[PDB]
Amino acid sequence: ITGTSTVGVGRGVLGDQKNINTTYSTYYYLQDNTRGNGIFTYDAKYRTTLPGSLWADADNQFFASYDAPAVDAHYYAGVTYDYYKNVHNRLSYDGNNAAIRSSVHYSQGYNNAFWNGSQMVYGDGDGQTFIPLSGGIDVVAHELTHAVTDYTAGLIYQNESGAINEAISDIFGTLVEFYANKNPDWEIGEDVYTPGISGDSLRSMSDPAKYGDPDHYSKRYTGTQDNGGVHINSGIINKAAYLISQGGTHYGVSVVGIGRDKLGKIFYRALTQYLTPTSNFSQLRAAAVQSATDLYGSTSQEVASVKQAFDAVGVK
Ligand SMILES: CC(C)C[C@H](NC(=O)[C@H](CN)NP(=O)(O)CNC(=O)OCc1ccccc1)C(=O)O
Ligand SMILES: [Ca+2]
Ligand SMILES: [Ca+2]
Ligand SMILES: [Ca+2]
Ligand SMILES: [Ca+2]
Ligand SMILES: [Zn+2]
């Protein structure tokens, strides 16, 4: 909408107060004009029609329980935009400052979030498996990263290419969580998953097997569930990325860690310069090796560590 840029205040899903960029024109709307061509947050009103209504508020204060998922979807989309711009010199998901749209209160008791080809969509959860999913910065960044992937490598959402697609979203979701630097970890979704159980998460990148996901190619899933295991076999790539950053010895193979920032540079370059819609795990290894070679040189430690990490997870 046309209006003037304003700054509201509210509370997110976890009860934390934050400022949000809004737009005033009769109402105060969740429209942040400070980033690209805007970040826009919508109310789906417990229905499944999308996007719903651009979120309107009478007083620019967003402290109601119903407001909390919208506050966090809007704010964490901003953080994710900042990460891609400041760290990778990428302007929004398309690289040309496309408007970022999110809808909250999608459906009833909906235990998921997704990118629908055009926008982000967040359920509220059923209150037992999940609380509203936009409360997780890693979840928000995971979703926006699907848009980045779709505009760049275009990895098809099935089998190995789809597991790479998922892992890319977990990797950058985690790197955005570290960028914001509030309780960062290598787990996915811990802030919104199972409010009655402490210490768990949807997936672990450091130990995928903790939640039944493979941590070696020899343990990959080859059935048809979950689009051929896209959220299962992502564990093999997530583990490789964790090893590249943090190091470790895994199935007897030692990896010298190079840190998060270099992990992000290597995988961002692989995603945007080398991967294709049909890339498999072996091709991802080659893309990561080439990306590290471009950035750091063929004789570098960074190249050596990429190779060790893919060796450790059985990907040649
Ligand atoms: C229990 C759940 C929460 C685990 C997991 N979901 C996730 O890990 C993440 C949230 N953390 N959501 P996503 O990967 O973006 C789901 N996207 C999707 O299925 O696209 C399918 C799709 C394709 C095209 C258009 C629209 C949708 C699952 O869905 O199995
Ligand atoms: Ca209000
Ligand atoms: Ca965390
Ligand atoms: Ca996390
Ligand atoms: Ca929990
Ligand atoms: Zn995903």
Question: How far, in Å, from the CA of 242 to the mean position of ligand 4?
Answer: 13
Structural domain contains residue 82: yes
The closest alpha carbon to 239, from 302, 292, 176, 315, belongs to 315
Give me 91's structure tokens.
Answer: 């302007």
Residue 188 Cα: closest atom of ligand 1: 11
With a 6 A CB cut-off, is 129 part of the ligand 1 pocket?
A: no
Count of residues for the chain?
316
Q: How far apart are CA 124 and CA 214, in angstroms?
A: 29
Residue 160 annotated as lining a ligand binding site: no
The closest alpha carbon to 244, from 171, 305, 298, belongs to 305
| Contact of 43 with 55, CB cutoff 8 Å | yes
Cβ neighbours, 10 Å, residue 300: 15
Q: How far apart are CA 74 and CA 159, in angstroms?
A: 32
User: Tokens 């760290």 correspond to what residue?
Assistant: 87
Residue 193 is given by DSSP the state B
**CATH code of residue 113:** 3.10.170.10
| Contact of 189 with 129, CB cutoff 8 Å | no
| Contact of 230 with 149, CB cutoff 8 Å | no
Residue 226 Cα: closest atom of ligand 1: 30
Question: How far, in Å, from the CA of 9 to the mean position of ligand 1?
Answer: 30
Bond from prior residue into 51 cis (ω within 30 degrees of 0): yes
Measured at the alpha carbon of residue 150, what is the angle toward residues 224 and 31, in degrees to the nearest 5? 120
Pocket probe for ligand 1: among 172, 231, 233, the residue whose CB has the most ligand atoms within 8 Å is 231
Pocket probe for ligand 1: among 103, 111, 114, the residue whose CB has the most ligand atoms within 8 Å is 114
Residue 194 annotated as lining a ligand binding site: yes
Structural domain contains residue 110: yes
Question: How far, in Å, from the CA of 299 to the mean position of ligand 3?
Answer: 35
**Could you give phi then psi for residue 220, rounded to 5 degrees?**
-65, 150
Question: How far, in Å, from the CA of 174 to the mean position of ligand 3?
Answer: 8
Q: How far apart are CA 155 and CA 167, in angstroms?
A: 11
Residues 13 and 144 in one domain: yes
State the maximum Cα–Cα separation within the chain, in Å, rounded to a whole number: 64
With a 6 A CB cut-off, is 139 part of the ligand 1 pocket?
A: yes
The closest alpha carbon to 141, from 162, 163, 122, belongs to 122
Residue 114: its H or E element: strand 113-115
List of residues 6+ apart from 6 with CB closer than 8 A: 21, 22, 23, 24, 28, 60
Residues 89 and 115 in one domain: yes
| Atom 11 of ligand 1, nearest CA residue | 139
Q: Three-class SS of residue 223?
A: coil
Q: How far apart are CA 124 and CA 110, in angstroms?
A: 6
Residues 259 and 247 in one domain: yes
Resolution to one decimal, Å: 1.3
Q: Residue ranges of the alpha helices (H) in 38-180? A: 68-88, 137-151, 159-180
- The amino acid at 235: G
**% helix, strand, coil for the chain, step of 5:** 40, 20, 40
| Contact of 56 with 27, CB cutoff 8 Å | yes
The closest alpha carbon to 191, from 137, 123, 142, 112, belongs to 137
Q: How far apart are CA 104 and CA 120, in angstroms?
A: 9
The domain containing residue 125 runs over which residues? Answer: 6-154
Helices 281-296 and 159-180 cross at an angle (nearest 10°) of 40
Structural domain contains residue 114: yes
Last residue of a domain, one of 125, 154, 183: 154
Cβ neighbours, 10 Å, residue 315: 21
Go through 146-185 and write b for each residue having 16 or more CB atoms within 10 A of its CB, e for each that does not: bbbbbbbbebbbebbbbbbbbbbbbbbbbbbbbbbeeebe
| Atom 17 of ligand 1, nearest CA residue | 114
Half-sphere exposure of 258 (CA within 13 A, CB side): 23
With a 6 A CB cut-off, is 142 part of the ligand 1 pocket?
A: yes
Residue 271 is given by DSSP the state I
Give me 138's structure tokens.
Answer: 């890693």
Catalytic residue flag (residue 88): no
Q: How many domains does the chain have?
A: 2
Last residue of a domain, one of 154, 180, 215: 154
Last residue of a domain, one of 154, 186, 215: 154
Helices 68-88 and 260-269 cross at an angle (nearest 10°) of 80
Cβ neighbours, 10 Å, residue 109: 13
With a 6 A CB cut-off, is 211 part of the ligand 1 pocket?
A: no
| Given 74, 88, 105, 143, the catalytic residue | 143
Residue 138 annotated as lining a ligand binding site: yes
List of residues 6+ apart from 70 with CB closer than 8 A: 30, 41, 43, 55, 62, 104, 105, 134
List of residues 6+ apart from 272 with CB closer than 8 A: 152, 153
Residues 51 and 115 in one domain: yes
Give how far Cα 159 sits from Cα of 220, 250, 281, Å. Answer: 10, 24, 10
Q: Three-class SS of residue 134?
A: helix
Catalytic residue flag (residue 143): yes
